[PDB]
Design an enzyme around this catalytic site. Structure first.
Site, PDB file in Angstrom:
ATOM      1  N   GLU A  46       0.939  -8.109  11.157  1.00 57.53           N
ATOM      2  CA  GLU A  46      -0.253  -7.291  11.389  1.00 57.53           C
ATOM      3  C   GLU A  46      -1.465  -8.111  11.828  1.00 57.53           C
ATOM      4  O   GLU A  46      -2.350  -7.589  12.508  1.00 57.53           O
ATOM      5  CB  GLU A  46      -0.604  -6.476  10.145  1.00 57.53           C
ATOM      6  CG  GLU A  46       0.408  -5.395   9.816  1.00 57.53           C
ATOM      7  CD  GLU A  46       1.510  -5.877   8.889  1.00 57.53           C
ATOM      8  OE1 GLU A  46       1.654  -7.107   8.706  1.00 57.53           O
ATOM      9  OE2 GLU A  46       2.236  -5.018   8.347  1.00 57.53           O
ATOM     10  N   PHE A 105       1.829   1.739  -6.118  1.00 61.22           N
ATOM     11  CA  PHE A 105       2.714   0.996  -5.228  1.00 61.22           C
ATOM     12  C   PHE A 105       2.041   0.721  -3.888  1.00 61.22           C
ATOM     13  O   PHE A 105       1.579   1.645  -3.217  1.00 61.22           O
ATOM     14  CB  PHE A 105       4.016   1.775  -5.022  1.00 61.22           C
ATOM     15  CG  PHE A 105       4.991   1.105  -4.102  1.00 61.22           C
ATOM     16  CD1 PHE A 105       5.466  -0.168  -4.381  1.00 61.22           C
ATOM     17  CD2 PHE A 105       5.445   1.752  -2.962  1.00 61.22           C
ATOM     18  CE1 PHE A 105       6.371  -0.786  -3.535  1.00 61.22           C
ATOM     19  CE2 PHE A 105       6.351   1.139  -2.111  1.00 61.22           C
ATOM     20  CZ  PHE A 105       6.815  -0.131  -2.399  1.00 61.22           C
ATOM     21  N   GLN A 106       1.978  -0.555  -3.519  1.00 61.08           N
ATOM     22  CA  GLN A 106       1.369  -0.985  -2.262  1.00 61.08           C
ATOM     23  C   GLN A 106      -0.045  -0.440  -2.071  1.00 61.08           C
ATOM     24  O   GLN A 106      -0.418  -0.042  -0.968  1.00 61.08           O
ATOM     25  CB  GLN A 106       2.247  -0.572  -1.077  1.00 61.08           C
ATOM     26  CG  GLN A 106       3.649  -1.147  -1.133  1.00 61.08           C
ATOM     27  CD  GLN A 106       4.338  -1.147   0.219  1.00 61.08           C
ATOM     28  OE1 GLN A 106       4.377  -0.130   0.913  1.00 61.08           O
ATOM     29  NE2 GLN A 106       4.870  -2.300   0.608  1.00 61.08           N
ATOM     30  N   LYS A 134      -1.603   9.107   2.494  1.00 61.55           N
ATOM     31  CA  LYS A 134      -0.349   9.654   3.002  1.00 61.55           C
ATOM     32  C   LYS A 134      -0.295  11.178   2.915  1.00 61.55           C
ATOM     33  O   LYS A 134       0.199  11.840   3.826  1.00 61.55           O
ATOM     34  CB  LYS A 134       0.837   9.048   2.245  1.00 61.55           C
ATOM     35  CG  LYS A 134       2.190   9.567   2.704  1.00 61.55           C
ATOM     36  CD  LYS A 134       3.324   8.674   2.228  1.00 61.55           C
ATOM     37  CE  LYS A 134       4.665   9.202   2.714  1.00 61.55           C
ATOM     38  NZ  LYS A 134       5.770   8.227   2.515  1.00 61.55           N
ATOM     39  N   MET A 180      -9.320 -31.176  15.843  1.00 61.83           N
ATOM     40  CA  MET A 180     -10.755 -31.110  15.586  1.00 61.83           C
ATOM     41  C   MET A 180     -11.105 -31.704  14.222  1.00 61.83           C
ATOM     42  O   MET A 180     -12.143 -32.349  14.070  1.00 61.83           O
ATOM     43  CB  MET A 180     -11.253 -29.666  15.687  1.00 61.83           C
ATOM     44  CG  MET A 180     -12.763 -29.516  15.540  1.00 61.83           C
ATOM     45  SD  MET A 180     -13.705 -30.495  16.731  1.00 61.83           S
ATOM     46  CE  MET A 180     -13.444 -29.549  18.228  1.00 61.83           C
TER      47      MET A 180
END
Ligand SMILES: Cc1cc2nc3c(=O)[nH]c(=O)nc-3n(C[C@H](O)[C@H](O)[C@H](O)COP(=O)(O)OP(=O)(O)OC[C@H]3O[C@@H](n4cnc5c(N)ncnc54)[C@H](O)[C@@H]3O)c2cc1C
Ligand SMILES: Cc1cc2nc3c(=O)[nH]c(=O)nc-3n(C[C@H](O)[C@H](O)[C@H](O)COP(=O)(O)OP(=O)(O)OC[C@H]3O[C@@H](n4cnc5c(N)ncnc54)[C@H](O)[C@@H]3O)c2cc1C
Ligand SMILES: COc1cnc(OC)n2nc(NS(=O)(=O)c3c(OCC(F)F)cccc3C(F)(F)F)nc12
Ligand SMILES: COc1cnc(OC)n2nc(NS(=O)(=O)c3c(OCC(F)F)cccc3C(F)(F)F)nc12
Ligand SMILES: C/C(NCc1cnc(C)nc1N)=C(/S)CCOP(=O)([O-])OP(=O)([O-])O
Ligand SMILES: C/C(NCc1cnc(C)nc1N)=C(/S)CCOP(=O)([O-])OP(=O)([O-])O
Ligand SMILES: C/C(NCc1cnc(C)nc1N)=C(/S)CCOP(=O)([O-])OP(=O)([O-])O
Ligand SMILES: [K+]
Ligand SMILES: [Mg+2]
Ligand SMILES: [Mg+2]
Ligand SMILES: [Mg+2]
Lengths: 582, 582, 287
Positions: free
Chosen positions: B59, B121-122, B171, B485
């Site tokens: 993602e 959950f999640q 959801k 760097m």
């Protein structure tokens, strides 16, 4: 008696104060990725002779490795990142450790104090961002606060209900010269006042009373029992009560034992879920009654008296109201009850042989099962072979998805902290870095990452970390060319309508894509692919016997479904025991 | 007139309402990674015939690709993720888009409304987490609010000072049936009231007055000018004022033009920084006076009258107090001034030929330079060759580090939105995904990711995305086996004491590690390695001429330093013009 | 001190807020729900199994009655000075324990709670958790509007009463029959008490009168009432107290009775902050 590399009257950089503060906490390993805001800290790390740094290739890899280090050892995991993009890369890991209650200390570099809040170069308000996804966090505003804050951070991360603590350290603080005071008192009066006292006899005797009056008792154990194996084991001997475990609790009680019902919940065994459904006494030890386990709450253990022992008072009475509860360390509660059960053994005469036999009938009728199609490799079978060849003694980390459930179902964990898996947040990309941390924490252990192809590629860059650090990490890649768990729900609930769940190349859809063997080859890691079930045993054996890191690409038919399955918010009567994507 | 796939009286899922809401905004491309909480959205996406999904492998890859899509087109970039670990993986990209003012709409799935705040959950409190790193965000609490919130999100992301807006969608809201109202008014009375009015004549004439009274004027242009190329170009013709650009502003004025001073700042050219140092008029258009440019503020343009034109009033007078300012669209301000300058041209008689000649002397004395050692490839040279072979017309995305500065220094961008780079946050791993988005937005363009080995491996998994989507993304990998760097700052300020900046394998330190060619081969992408400067030209030509994706591994000596360099918080008199790690 | 509180008891906790159950003390049995429903459920069981259970705690009750006899609520009467405790008892008697009582915060609040026998709930209106001064008079206003036929009395302290004294205007204009029983001790009494017990009676801004005329009642609360057209009176002698309260009750409409009390009174008993039952103070004052 600690020995400093500096004289007691000698001023030194704040960064050197921070590193020594870690040494005084007994830190031996950190997972640190350098950047401008944390350069001073990294310079100070090289001056340490006791702390080893494992350089990851991504800070998400760093924090997930710290997690694996923690979950596999019971010690705090320590990750370090620079400001801005370094800090924000830790976020998934912080949230993961909070939801699964993992002890973790994250240190982030920060822009100079005067520039905080000015949209400065690589500036992120990381304390603001991570406040709701850490147990606690700090913004260090003076070099003299470093010893106290570090001590508090480790204390908070490891005490009570363990969790992640983040410490944000401005660059100018790292550069400031000072003489540290190591004998300063922590400022946590509220937290310390709420720390649970040792379990009172009155409550423990209340529990023993319920046990002697029950006929169908079931143990419901979770992550809170990971440090209570001996006590829980002793408890089961004295009572004969069968054990059902959560995903987080696997291995607390030996999974190969006769009294083990293995895992309960959405993808739990039929007999475990049956036991809870028909129990009259539910002994909930170190669990948080999550809906992945309970389903519809009103139907969960609907005929049972519930005993809940948790170290977090906020968890007791949250989703379900217990008849008896103990707010305290389940380790101490078990010890207390074991003494009572032993002294009154010939008086109590505990015997749930009839109940146990009823459950054994369920084990025989509805065991964990899988189907073998020709010479195609059953993922369930692959894990069973791994179990056999490692004698159930390996440390197992996983990704998230179907392979995760199968790794939980078909491997009999004998001890706690063998099983390393993201449960609450369920983060893909966890497996490989977690295995890295576990291997560093357990150099002599067999460490295997049972990963999915979607999950594995997410942090595939940590293969470089594995080779460079010479870690004997084994990768058992269950490759189904899909986002399997999403594919399964598409099959069951969306008429198999695919919505971006295929991970291969549609222009060559019968070719394995990507070629994970070449990912390993890129990082000088030996690898192989197995496709036929007949070759699977030797292939896994080769993976185990080959010294150092190894990747085994196990090709699996994608039509497999995880069974059994209790639908979301459903009851035991809704359990699905057959079917797939064929 | 928009055509819906549903009847006006036909109820349909909230997820289908959301997808249509995107269609009505003109969205043609999203970067969406599926999960449980966002499954309904993905199902609805397949029912759309106008929106294409590019499935990333992470993602962070998704959000960075949306950024590249946006930066290269001027359109909003759209990424979608599931709840929990999906949402938290977007965080670096959100912060990146905010700091660089990039228009972006991120949509995240969320647990059912009733379960919000229960450690479900999640579940991640993503609205809380991302509040300080987005321009604005939303938690949708009713299906009927979807059309309005989506409209507001796109409006806020693209209007004024562009930025990321996140929309969190439970959801159960996605599953709820409703009939959408598309003609509802936005609820942003405060924001709309603060939208700058078109620039007033009185202020523009004030500026023209200062120009006619100055003898050493310098243009100081940045990201705010990316949509003002024609106007700025016209402005320069009418005034003859030399142009100094920020990292974010590169290409707003043609870098190959004689009046171009190229980039100013920490690693800016000596003549650009000289111009600002000795200017008596500083025309700051679309810039935010960051310390990477200004160094020590009191010394920055210390003898100049400052004109600041910004669309964000909070930026005007923040770090430096202007003598003249315009709060509004610099595009409109330029148009207004151009008309005045044209009508009064023969009256003003603008001629800064003496000043320009003074600056040309500086160009001749202190040009951008590099040293060639034997047959070793100078990274600076590699970029120059790329410039020549692509006629300065390629879209260039980068990672962060030395290679980023060289890509900015040694490529003459002719137009804006050729240059795609993370400036404010400076996030590694940006290059490859950003190139993905740019290629999708610009299918006929030459797209090259100039990446570092540390940066490239961070999101190396997006190689799979490139092959599957058949994107002609070229990768010019400047490989120095180091975190370059950081290595440079170690050399200059820490006596070259290495603190975890080497990215190769110490057990084989003179072997290139990892083998990036095999990463490409794993994803079926043709690749090659070049080590000798003589072979470099043909190798790059081969990369460009070979249809489809291609990886060129350019091996570079690590002792190279980015020059010139003005030290942190330093002045022009502190500029470093020579030295490296040899 | 929690560890000492009910240290030998099995604890049953019934609360409608789950966050309260197990917060400060862990119960052996709990019910998260409406206590009204829990009582109804238990009452049916207790009634059906009455002849089976045979509940009899007469021995325990007798043990407690001995404690009632040994250590009852008590107060001391000094000459003709008015005991604040007595004033509330008289109010109880004359109103037959049926009045709505609102209070301020302090000593007078505790005495109003100790020496008035409330027969029904929602007679007692007092700020407990926050303990805000100035609550009494406005709360009585709301109670009177809600209960137009009820006897409403604000038992207030002089510090508390003056804080929202402006609501006297509201009372007159709205024609509310609010009675004010002002227990006037010229002090911030409760603070004065803690000064006596724990700071050697060192006064730190607890005197509310005028030091230039310290034996004059200040302010004159009667004139506050007169300003708002509310009839008022002051009583100083215990002998006159009964008729004065009766006059307050019998006089239609609002009324203020300024009851002058010796300031050396202390609220008893007192268990010190974070203390145990063994630390209870049962005697002493500021004399
Ligand atoms: C795809 C997927 C599917 C899943 N399906 C299932 C499933 O079928 N079955 C299942 O079980 N899980 C499943 N989960 C995992 C689930 O989401 C949770 O992670 C897990 O069920 C919760 O574990 P727990 O109840 O043991 O509590 P934990 O998250 O492990 O927390 C431990 C609890 O014990 C307490 N505690 C900690 N230490 C002590 C101590 N010393 N003494 C007393 N108390 C203590 C803590 O306060 C806490 O309340 C799944 C996850 C994923 C990603
Ligand atoms: C390793 C590294 C080194 C760097 N060194 C340098 C360097 O040497 N030189 C350098 O320049 N940068 C350098 N940077 C980048 C630097 O950190 C900033 O990203 C950049 O300098 C800021 O760009 P900006 O001033 O143009 O403002 P931006 O971030 O581009 O913001 C645009 C400004 O213009 C305004 N604006 C937007 N639209 C309009 C409009 N239509 N009309 C009017 N105003 C508008 C905005 O409100 C905002 O204030 C470096 C970055 C990295 C990672
Ligand atoms: C392009 O700027 C840097 C590039 N590479 C670096 O390390 C390899 N650093 N390190 C810094 N430190 S810094 O210059 O004092 C600074 C900074 O400078 C403030 C200065 F005025 F003190 C402002 C914000 C962030 C940082 C940071 F996070 F990078 F440290 N800046 C750079
Ligand atoms: C292991 O649980 C899931 C596995 N795989 C999934 O999609 C491929 N899903 N999808 C869900 N949705 S869910 O069951 O309604 C749910 C959830 O269930 C609540 C239910 F009571 F409605 C609670 C929290 C999150 C989710 C989420 F985010 F996953 F959607 N759960 C799973
Ligand atoms: C997309 C998704 N879940 C949503 C999701 C998205 N993104 C992240 C970071 N984590 C999760 N859990 C899964 S479980 C797919 C897993 O695919 P896999 O890694 O190949 O495992 P498997 O195929 O066995 O299910
Ligand atoms: C570590 C670091 N910066 C800190 C850092 C850490 N982590 C992230 C995500 N971003 C940044 N900017 C750099 S620039 C090293 C870059 O190495 P490189 O990608 O190979 O490029 P180069 O070697 O040319 O400097
Ligand atoms: C100062 C104080 N408490 C602190 C205080 C300060 N300010 C407010 C608004 N509320 C409180 N509770 C009290 S109880 C003094 C009360 O004096 P009183 O109103 O005349 O009652 P009494 O003298 O009987 O204690
Ligand atoms: K990655
Ligand atoms: Mg898969
Ligand atoms: Mg490099
Ligand atoms: Mg008083």
């Amino acid at each position: 008696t600690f020995i400093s590399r500096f004289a007691p009257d000698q001023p030194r950089k704040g960064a050197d104060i921070l590193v020594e503060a870690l040494e005084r906490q007994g830190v031996e390993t950190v997972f640190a990725y350098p950047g401008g805001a944390s350069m001073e800290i990294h310079q100070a790390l090289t001056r340490s002779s006791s702390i080893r740094n494992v350089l990851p290739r991504h800070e998400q890899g760093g924090v997930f490795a710290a997690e694996g280090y923690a979950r596999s050892s019971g010690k705090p995991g320590i990750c370090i990142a620079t400001s801005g993009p370094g800090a924000t890369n830790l976020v998934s890991g912080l949230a993961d450790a909070l939801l699964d209650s993992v002890p973790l200390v994250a240190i982030t570099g920060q822009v100079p104090r005067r520039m905080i809040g000015t949209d400065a170069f690589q500036e992120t308000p990381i304390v603001e961002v991570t406040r709701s996804i850490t147990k606690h966090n700090y913004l260090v505003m003076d070099v003299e606060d470093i010893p106290r804050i570090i001590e508090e951070a480790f204390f908070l991360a490891t005490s009570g209900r363990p969790g992640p603590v983040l410490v944000d350290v401005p660059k100018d603080i790292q550069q400031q010269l000072a003489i540290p005071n190591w004998e300063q008192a922590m400022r946590l009066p509220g937290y310390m006042s709420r720390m649970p006292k040792p379990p009172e006899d009155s409550h423990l005797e209340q529990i023993v009373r319920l046990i002697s009056e029950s006929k169908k008792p079931v143990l419901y154990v979770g992550g809170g029992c990971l440090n209570s194996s001996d006590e829980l084991g002793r408890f089961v001997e004295l009572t004969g009560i069968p054990v059902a475990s959560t995903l987080m609790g696997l291995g607390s009680y030996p999974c190969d034992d006769e009294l083990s019902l293995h895992m309960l919940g959405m993808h739990g065994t039929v007999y475990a879920n049956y036991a809870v459904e028909h129990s009259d006494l539910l002994l909930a030890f170190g669990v948080r009654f999550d809906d992945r386990v309970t389903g519809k709450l009103e139907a969960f253990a609907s005929r049972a008296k519930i005993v809940h022992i948790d170290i977090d008072s906020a968890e007791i009475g949250k989703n379900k109201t217990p008849h008896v509860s103990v707010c305290g360390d389940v380790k101490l509660a078990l010890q207390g009850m074991n003494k009572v059960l032993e002294n009154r053994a010939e008086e109590l005469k505990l015997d749930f042989g009839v109940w146990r036999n009823e459950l054994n009938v369920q084990k025989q009728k509805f065991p964990l099962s899988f189907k073998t199609f020709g010479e195609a490799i059953p993922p369930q079978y692959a894990i069973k072979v791994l179990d056999e060849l490692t004698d159930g003694k390996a440390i197992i980390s996983t990704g998230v998805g179907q392979h995760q459930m199968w790794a939980a179902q078909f491997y009999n964990y004998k001890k706690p902290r063998q099983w390393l898996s993201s449960g609450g947040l369920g983060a893909m990309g966890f497996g490989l870095p977690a295995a890295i941390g576990a291997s560093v924490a357990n150099p002599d252990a067999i460490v295997v990452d049972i990963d999915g192809d979607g999950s594995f590629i997410m942090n595939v860059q940590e293969l470089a970390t594995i080779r460079v650090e010479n870690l004997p990490v084994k990768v058992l890649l269950l490759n189904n060319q899909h986002l399997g768990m999403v594919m399964q729900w598409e099959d069951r609930f969306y008429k198999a309508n695919r919505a971006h769940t295929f991970l291969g190349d549609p222009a060559q859809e019968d070719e394995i894509f990507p070629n994970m063997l070449l990912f390993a080859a890129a990082c000088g890691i030996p690898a192989a692919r197995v496709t036929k079930k007949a070759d699977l045993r030797e292939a896994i054996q080769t993976m185990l016997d080959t010294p150092g890191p190894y990747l085994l690409d196990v090709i699996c038919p994608h039509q497999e479904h995880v069974l059994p399955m209790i639908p979301s918010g459903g009851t035991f009567n809704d359990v699905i025991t057959e079917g797939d994507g064929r």
